[PDB]
Ligand binder design. Structure first.
Ligand SMILES: CCCCCCCCCCCCCCCCCC(=O)OC[C@H](COP(=O)([O-])OCC(O)COP(=O)([O-])OC[C@@H](COC(=O)CCCCCCCCCCCCCCCCC)OC(=O)CCCCCCCCCCCCCCCCC)OC(=O)CCCCCCCCCCCCCCCCC
Ligand SMILES: CCCCCCCCCCCCCCCCCC(=O)OC[C@H](COP(=O)([O-])OCC(O)COP(=O)([O-])OC[C@@H](COC(=O)CCCCCCCCCCCCCCCCC)OC(=O)CCCCCCCCCCCCCCCCC)OC(=O)CCCCCCCCCCCCCCCCC
Ligand SMILES: CCCCCCCCCCCCCCCCCC(=O)OC[C@H](COP(=O)([O-])OCC(O)COP(=O)([O-])OC[C@@H](COC(=O)CCCCCCCCCCCCCCCCC)OC(=O)CCCCCCCCCCCCCCCCC)OC(=O)CCCCCCCCCCCCCCCCC
Ligand SMILES: CCCCCCCCCCCCCCCCCC(=O)OC[C@H](COP(=O)([O-])OCC(O)COP(=O)([O-])OC[C@@H](COC(=O)CCCCCCCCCCCCCCCCC)OC(=O)CCCCCCCCCCCCCCCCC)OC(=O)CCCCCCCCCCCCCCCCC
Ligand SMILES: CCCCCCCCCCCCCCCCCC(=O)OC[C@H](COP(=O)([O-])OCC(O)COP(=O)([O-])OC[C@@H](COC(=O)CCCCCCCCCCCCCCCCC)OC(=O)CCCCCCCCCCCCCCCCC)OC(=O)CCCCCCCCCCCCCCCCC
Ligand SMILES: CCCCCCCCCCCCCCCCCC(=O)OC[C@H](COP(=O)([O-])OCC[N+](C)(C)C)OC(=O)CCCCCCCCCCCCCCCCC
Ligand SMILES: COC1=C(OC)C(=O)C(C/C=C(\C)CC/C=C(\C)CC/C=C(\C)CC/C=C(\C)CC/C=C(\C)CC/C=C(/C)CC/C=C(\C)CCC=C(C)C)=C(C)C1=O
Lengths: 108, 200, 161, 50, 58, 140, 41, 106, 74, 231
């Protein structure tokens, strides 16, 4: 549960959003933090990642960071469909709703 | 760098003679002359120019002065012999680099190695035959002449021609295949029976 | 200045004298340590031509040494006759006969001609790479012209008023 | 084979073994190919029956 | 990069080079003039085999 | 410079003082003799035999890495991993087995190391002073 | 820079504690010898 | 020519001097000696003719962030510039001229 | 002398592995040597020690027989 | 310079500069369903998702040994993308490769990740060495700045700033200080500084045609026997 951060071991924390407004604010902060993202302030809920300097491989790095913060296990079949900010928000809702009903994480 | 002077001195040998420290003994190039190079006559002109500048083109001074050998070439054959013993493969590699720039075909290289190793193989058999003649001499047969190329009325055996035809039909006698008969091991039956008789 | 990291990861099974992975470069380094540096002669004449008489003595000494030692030298000469005739008549065409008979077999020449051209390309490496940069530098200089125009707008706006 | 003249008492030792190696592994190439075809291997060779 | 070609057993010269210019210089007069295909590994084998109604899979 | 050369220095420390400080600068012949047998860093002190091993070890190891790094014959039998048609899969373990057999290259060198030499004919010639004997000497 | 070791102008104590590129290779080989104690053992 | 002399004097014909010195050392140097495998302070010569790419703006930010003015430039560009890439290429003066007519009205 | 040479040659293999420990251990391309080096080394030691041990038993049987048989003939 | 003169240099039996589908006898041919009994083929439609998972594996398994170095992670990402963007930008028509270019590259990248998972890939060992040499130099600068001392890089920057003032104060006729003139000022200082350092000889030949090595000592012979160590 611990990771190196600039040569120092730091305890990593996990997030539990469970709310639509918390999901949108997290995803926006997630994409803005990525070093390849352009026009960070022009980024809105309906922003296409291709319009901000992101390609299919940058979506993998973004999804890899979601598994770090939220603790998800996202399969490789789902990653290539995450091409908008809206897609990350709807996917996070689908995972939390799936775990609230099925009592287990989605298939990985 | 830091370890350059130490490592360069450790890797290679330098010249310890101070032959050229003496001014008048320095050669003009007339001691070891190249005879067949295409610029041969340009070498002689430079030697003549060196002799003329030393005497201000009054060569009578050279005739009256003493002539010296090339002291820088002293003990050069010994120095190459010591480098050959120090690193034989490194000496051979660099002395043959210019010659090995032209590489003959795989066929020619194989012919060189084949005939060379084949000649050494015949030499080894010739040495072994000399030991046979020494054993024959000690066994009581005096030997006139030498070798196995019988001049008289005897059969000769020339040695296997180093071509695949004879190398498929014949092969040399391997001495390690001549063994003591395994019936020798049956004498150990005497030991097993003796041990039981003695209650061992 | 922010304090940087103390060090990166240090691999426990990789060293300079014992590199973990293999290539011809490390083998080339150990090869030249073995054969040593290029044995540069400092003299005015080569060693063979200066000692022709002496090397001829030692050349014939070992010939006589082998000749005096080999008492059955005639048996070796006769034993070598058959393979000498056989291998030379068999490989004559592939070595020499092809140069004036049925087929040239220029495969080995094609390898010399390609390598001779690469020798020239390496000799002109600095020239060819410098011409390629002249076009990239031209593109870079063209993009830097927009900043030169902008730096004069403040002077233009002031002089226009 | 000239460089192997002193490696044994037979100059053609490596050639005599290689001709057997060449025979065995070439003989096994068709056998492994039929194994790759599977149980249908006969249909790959002759085709459909009549 | 030379160690990467060796450790992955990509020992076909010029396989990962987009323009194997050395491969073209070596085959200027070769029979069946061809250069290695891009990123060809010496171990991969894409051979197939089919059984048809005719012989030899035709 | 190696530990064996440094061990010689501590033993020859007083000898180096007599040669380098006293003899190497006294005068005349004693000076020339002391400057010739001076003690210090070995000029041309590299050991080519050490270097011959390092080169040949590295070159033979790169060959071991290639011959031992093969795709498995067993894994290709099911046609479910990476190999559908491999008509020469039965050659996959020849090079690995050949490199592993090279470990006994020096252990079994010559005839004496592959058998019990006293039961062979060549042993009798060595005990006879490397002398030729009749081929049936082991029987008589 | 000017204090770099010279094979001619060298002290006895400096040569004994030189520790050059030859020793750096050996120290790497020694690390392999020590790490192989359990395997060889 | 193809007739250069005897075999013993073959290594003699190779040397070509740039000075007038006599006698001339015959040996023609083949390579440069490389006794110590030292890591060169020189940058790699592979970085020769690579076109513009992502490493140019990534290193520009790293060197700009070493200054106070550069830190302001980087922050404003990555936040308040509507561009789909950091590889900025000026192919027209549309954004420049329209920024001047919207400014000189005062 | 044979048993001593083959023991020194086997010791040479252990040095070859130790001198190249990092490559034989960390490089997966040499995994087969790392795995099967101890199996081959045990077989080599097995042959060396088997030959020495069997030779030693045969010498003891010979020595004890010539002494027992000599006393009977006396 | 020198240009290839053979106009047919890039000609192959399959076309100009064709390194995607070389011409061979056993050419691919179609299969007809109604006439095919059985088939043995290894091709599938799994390369796309395998390409995505391989990128995630190579990225995440390499970041294990970065010690949280954020700049190194971002630099490694740029390098990792350059490895995966090869088939998308190459001159070679990767979509026309003989037996499926997608499968070929995915299997090729899997061999790289296998080495990466063991932390033995040469790109990894090269990254640790390059980063250690870089951080050692950054730590040297940090220790000099904490001590109030001026770094060698700041001395040149300060020295180059006063050179531009001196040149633009004497160049009053023209007032266009181009980047060409700015460059040759720095290069004149860089050459003088590089020649000042005690560096190993990089060029083959010095001012004369002779080589700059320790082996380039010819006659005249003027060196005595080597002297021993002093006590
Ligand atoms: C009363 C009681 C006492 C009685 C005493 C009686 C005796 C009197 C004693 C004194 C006698 C001499 C008088 C003084 C002479 C001074 C002359 C001089 O100024 O120096 C010239 C000469 C100049 O040499 P240099 O100019 O520096 O270099 C030579 C050239 O540059 C060339 O260098 P290079 O590199 O080109 O090599 C070529 C060289 C040599 O190159 C060679 O090829 C020779 C190879 C020889 C070694 C190999 C031998 C083969 C067998 C062994 C194999 C080796 C294998 C190694 C490799 C392993 C296998 C791969 O060619 C030479 O032969 C040079 C020799 C000197 C020239 C003389 C004319 C030579 C023609 C005759 C040739 C036949 C003899 C050759 C002997 C060579 C000995 C060095 O220096 C000497 O000769 C030094 C000799 C003085 C030594 C004094 C030792 C103490 C004296 C007392 C000893 C007590 C002995 C008791 C005996 C008891 C009775 C049995
Ligand atoms: C010898 C004269 C009589 C003696 C009197 C002394 C005369 C004073 C001079 C003596 C001093 C120099 C001695 C000659 C040296 C050669 C001359 C030279 O340097 O020229 C540069 C020469 C470059 O040649 P190039 O003419 O500039 O261009 C050639 C082109 O590549 C392609 O050229 P190409 O396309 O036009 O033709 C291909 C081929 C031309 O085709 C051939 O050369 C045919 C070669 C076929 C095989 C011949 C085997 C020789 C027999 C040896 C077997 C033992 C002898 C006893 C048994 C037989 C009895 C007859 O090229 C060549 O090989 C050129 C060499 C031709 C002349 C030299 C041939 C000598 C053969 C001996 C003649 C008979 C001697 C009887 C022995 C007498 C003893 C009492 O250097 C060479 O590389 C060629 C030499 C042979 C190298 C082959 C590769 C050997 C690699 C061995 C690797 C294994 C070693 C392991 C290391 C060992 C442990 C550390
Ligand atoms: C899918 C396609 C097929 C698969 C392709 C994959 C092949 C991979 C190739 C990779 C190359 C190997 C890489 C490593 C080699 C590097 C070292 C080297 O040897 O290069 C030589 C290197 C290159 O030579 P080169 O001068 O450039 O000439 C190159 C070629 O010859 C070209 O020059 P050329 O055009 O002027 O040659 C004309 C040619 C003209 O030849 C012809 O026109 C017709 C030839 C018909 C042959 C007739 C056979 C008769 C059989 C009768 C047998 C009776 C006795 C049998 C007894 C057995 C028991 C009953 O005649 C020759 O001179 C041929 C040269 C000797 C050939 C020896 C092997 C022949 C059979 C090859 C088996 C492969 C078959 C593949 C299937 C191909 C089907 C199309 O030169 C050197 O010698 C330097 C290296 C020093 C070597 C000396 C010691 C050699 C021993 C150690 C070598 C290394 C270990 C062994 C490896 C294999 C060697 C045999
Ligand atoms: C001196 C030496 C001489 C010989 C030299 C060579 C030595 C031999 C080595 C060669 C290789 C042998 C190793 C084979 C490994 C096989 C492993 C395996 O079992 O995997 C299964 C595998 C089959 O799976 P698959 O093909 O991948 O796909 C199957 C489908 O998924 C399935 O689709 P499906 O479900 O629609 O199919 C339905 C079913 C249909 O099956 C049927 O046809 C049914 C048959 C009728 C059953 C009885 C019905 C009874 C009805 C009763 C009714 C009761 C109900 C009554 C009413 C109810 C009452 C209330 O098919 C099957 O499932 C059966 C396939 C497997 C059959 C077994 C084939 C291997 C038998 C080998 C026997 C001998 C082995 C000795 C080896 C000893 C070890 C050394 O077997 C094979 O692949 C066989 C390949 C054979 C190729 C090699 C042939 C080489 C040629 C040899 C002769 C060369 C002569 C010339 C020599 C020249 C000099 C060299
Ligand atoms: C009680 C103790 C404690 C127990 C509990 C703890 C221990 C538990 C187990 C621990 C681990 C054990 C390790 C093994 C299990 C590993 C499981 C696994 O998943 O690994 C997968 C593993 C994964 O692959 P990889 O990691 O990528 O690479 C694996 C290897 O690097 C190499 O992979 P590869 O695929 O490349 O290897 C291929 C090689 C593998 O090597 C072998 O397995 C040797 C095979 C020799 C036998 C071949 C049988 C042929 C058909 C015979 C049919 C009848 C059988 C009757 C036998 C009767 C015997 C008298 O086989 C071949 O070379 C195939 C070609 C053979 C040439 C042609 C010969 C066939 C035709 C013969 C015709 C002659 C007769 C004709 C007439 C017949 C009469 C009518 O693959 C393996 O199989 C690993 C094998 C490792 C070697 C293990 C043994 C080391 C040596 C130990 C001492 C000797 C013991 C074995 C002796 C066997 C009898 C000779
Ligand atoms: C030297 C010591 C080591 C020796 C190792 C062997 C070295 C071999 C060197 C490489 C030569 C390989 C020749 C391959 C064929 C090249 C010619 C060609 O491509 O044909 C094009 C030819 C020629 O077309 P072309 O256009 O290229 O040439 C035209 C010719 N002229 C110019 C004269 C008009 O076209 C064909 O398609 C014919 C195909 C015939 C196939 C013949 C080869 C079949 C055998 C190859 C497989 C062998 C595998 C053996 C493996 C054994 C394993 C157990
Ligand atoms: C394991 O994988 C493998 C490799 O690694 C990848 C290989 O490199 C290789 C290739 C092998 C090589 C490159 C090695 C080749 C070596 C060969 C052929 C033989 C070497 C022979 C010599 C160097 C000659 C040395 C001469 C002698 C031993 C005779 C004189 C006796 C001497 C000098 C020793 C005296 C005897 C003793 C018992 C005392 C021992 C002395 C010491 C231990 C002193 C050491 C002192 C210190 C301070 C270390 C293989 C085959 C391999 O399988």
């Amino acid at each position: 549960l611990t990771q190196y951060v600039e040569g120092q071991i730091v305890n990593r924390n996990q997030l539990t959003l469970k709310k639509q407004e918390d999901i949108e604010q997290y995803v926006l902060k997630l994409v803005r933090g990525y070093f390849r993202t352009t026009n960070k302030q022009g980024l809105n809920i309906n922003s296409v990642l291709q319009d901000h300097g992101l390609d299919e491989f940058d979506s993998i790095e973004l999804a890899m960071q979601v598994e770090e913060d939220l603790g998800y296990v996202i399969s490789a079949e789902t990653i290539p469909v995450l091409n908008k900010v809206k897609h990350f928000v709807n996917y996070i809702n689908h995972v939390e709703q799936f775990k609230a009903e099925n009592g287990k994480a989605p298939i990985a | 760098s830091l370890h350059e002077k130490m490592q360069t001195d450790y890797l290679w040998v330098k010249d310890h003679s101070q032959a050229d420290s003496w001014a008048k003994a320095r050669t003009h190039g007339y001691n070891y002359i190249a005879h067949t190079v295409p610029n041969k006559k340009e070498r002689y002109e430079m030697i003549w120019r060196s002799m003329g500048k030393s005497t201000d083109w009054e060569l009578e001074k050279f005739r009256l002065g003493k002539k010296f050998p090339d002291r820088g070439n002293k003990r050069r054959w010994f120095k190459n012999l010591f480098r050959l013993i120090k690193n034989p493969m490194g000496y051979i590699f660099w002395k043959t680099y210019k010659a090995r720039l032209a590489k003959p075909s795989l066929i020619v290289t194989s012919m060189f190695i084949g005939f060379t190793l084949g000649f050494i193989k015949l030499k080894a058999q010739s040495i072994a035959y000399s030991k046979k003649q020494y054993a024959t001499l000690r066994a009581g047969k005096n030997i006139e002449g030498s070798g196995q190329v019988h001049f008289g009325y005897h059969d000769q055996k020339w040695g296997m021609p180093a071509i695949p035809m004879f190398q498929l039909m014949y092969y040399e006698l391997p001495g390690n295949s001549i063994v003591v008969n395994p019936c020798r091991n049956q004498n150990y039956r005497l030991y097993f029976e003796m041990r039981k008789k003695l209650g061992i | 200045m922010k304090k940087p990291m103390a060090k990166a990861y240090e691999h426990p099974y990789n060293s300079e004298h014992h590199p973990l992975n293999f290539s011809a470069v490390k083998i080339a380094e150990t090869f030249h340590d073995f054969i040593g540096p290029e044995q540069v002669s400092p003299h005015y004449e080569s060693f063979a031509m200066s000692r022709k008489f002496l090397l001829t003595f030692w050349g014939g000494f070992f010939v006589l040494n082998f000749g005096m030692a080999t008492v059955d030298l005639n048996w070796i000469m006769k034993s070598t006759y058959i393979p000498w005739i056989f291998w030379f008549q068999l490989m004559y065409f592939y070595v020499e006969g092809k140069n004036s008979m049925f087929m040239p077999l220029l495969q080995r020449f094609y390898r010399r001609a390609a390598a001779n051209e690469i020798f020239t390309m390496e000799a002109f490496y600095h020239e060819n790479i410098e011409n390629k940069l002249r076009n990239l530098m031209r593109i870079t200089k063209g993009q830097l012209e927009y900043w030169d125009i902008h730096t004069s707008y403040g002077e233009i706006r002031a002089d226009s008023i | 084979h000239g460089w192997t003249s002193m490696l044994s008492h037979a100059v053609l030792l490596l050639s005599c073994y290689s001709i057997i190696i060449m025979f065995l592994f070439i003989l096994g190439m068709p056998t492994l190919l039929l194994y790759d075809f599977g149980i249908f291997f006969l249909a790959y060779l002759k085709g459909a029956g009549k | 990069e030379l160690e990467e070609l060796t450790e992955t057993h990509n020992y076909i010269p010029g396989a990962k080079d987009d323009v194997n210019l050395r491969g073209y210089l070596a085959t200027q007069f070769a029979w069946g003039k061809k250069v290695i295909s891009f990123y060809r590994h010496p171990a991969d084998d894409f051979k197939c085999a089919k059984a048809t109604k005719n012989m030899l899979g035709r | 410079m190696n530990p064996i050369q440094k061990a010689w220095l501590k033993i020859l420390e007083p000898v180096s003082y007599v040669i380098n400080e006293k003899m190497a600068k006294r005068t005349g012949i004693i000076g020339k003799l002391g400057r010739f047998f001076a003690i210090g860093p070995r000029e041309y002190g590299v050991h080519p035999i050490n270097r011959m091993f390092i080169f040949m070890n590295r070159k033979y190891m790169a060959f071991q890495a290639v011959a031992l790094h093969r795709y498995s014959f067993v894994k290709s039998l099911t046609h479910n991993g990476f190999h559908m048609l491999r008509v020469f899969r039965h050659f996959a373990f020849v090079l690995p087995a050949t490199v592993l057999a090279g470990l006994g290259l020096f252990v079994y060198w010559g005839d004496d190391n592959k058998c019990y030499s006293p039961d062979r004919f060549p042993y009798l010639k060595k005990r006879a002073g490397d002398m030729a004997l009749p081929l049936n000497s082991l029987n008589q | 820079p000017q204090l770099w070791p010279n094979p001619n102008k060298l002290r006895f104590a400096d040569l004994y504690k030189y520790q050059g590129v030859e020793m750096k290779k050996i120290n790497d080989s020694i690390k392999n010898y020590k790490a192989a104690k359990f395997y060889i053992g | 020519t193809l007739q250069w002399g005897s075999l013993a004097e073959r290594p003699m014909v190779d040397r070509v001097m740039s000075t007038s010195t006599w006698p001339v050392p015959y040996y023609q140097r083949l390579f440069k000696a490389y006794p110590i495998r030292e890591k060169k302070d020189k940058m790699s010569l592979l970085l020769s003719d690579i076109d513009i790419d992502d490493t140019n703006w990534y290193q520009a930010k790293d060197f700009l962030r070493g200054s106070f003015r550069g830190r302001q430039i980087v922050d404003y560009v990555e936040n308040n510039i509507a561009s789909n890439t950091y590889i900025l290429i000026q192919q027209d003066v549309a954004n420049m001229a329209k920024a001047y007519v919207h400014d000189i009205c005062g | 002398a044979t048993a001593l040479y083959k023991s020194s040659a086997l010791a040479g293999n252990l040095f070859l592995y130790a001198y190249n420990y990092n490559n034989f251990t960390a490089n997966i391309r040499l995994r087969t040597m790392r795995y099967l080096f101890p199996v081959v080394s045990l077989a080599i030691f097995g042959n060396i020690y088997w030959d020495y041990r069997s030779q030693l038993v045969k010498v003891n049987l010979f020595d004890e027989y010539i002494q027992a048989r000599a006393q009977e003939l006396v | 310079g020198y240009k290839i003169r053979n106009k047919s240099i890039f000609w192959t039996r399959a076309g100009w500069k064709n390194n995607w589908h070389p011409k061979n006898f056993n050419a691919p041919r179609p299969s007809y369903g109604e006439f095919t009994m059985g088939i043995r083929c290894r091709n599938d439609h799994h390369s796309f998702l395998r390409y995505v998972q391989t990128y995630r594996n190579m990225s995440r398994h390499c970041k294990q040994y970065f010690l949280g170095d954020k700049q190194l992670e971002e630099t490694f990402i740029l390098g990792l993308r350059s490895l995966f963007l090869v088939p998308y930008d190459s001159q070679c028509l990767t979509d026309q490769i003989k037996h499926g270019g997608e499968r070929r590259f995915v299997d090729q990248l899997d061999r790289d990740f296998e080495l990466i998972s063991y932390n033995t890939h040469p790109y990894q060992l090269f990254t640790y060495t390059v980063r250690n040499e870089h951080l050692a130099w950054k730590n040297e600068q940090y220790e000099k700045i904490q001590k109030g001392e001026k770094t060698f890089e700041q001395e040149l920057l300060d020295y180059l700033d006063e050179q531009v003032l001196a040149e633009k104060a004497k160049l009053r006729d023209g007032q266009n200080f181009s980047i060409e003139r700015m460059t040759e000022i720095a290069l004149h200082v860089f050459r003088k500084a590089r020649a000042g350092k005690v560096r190993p000889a990089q060029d083959v030949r010095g001012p004369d045609g002779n080589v700059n090595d320790f082996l380039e000592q010819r006659r005249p012979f003027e060196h005595p026997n080597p002297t021993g160590v002093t006590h």
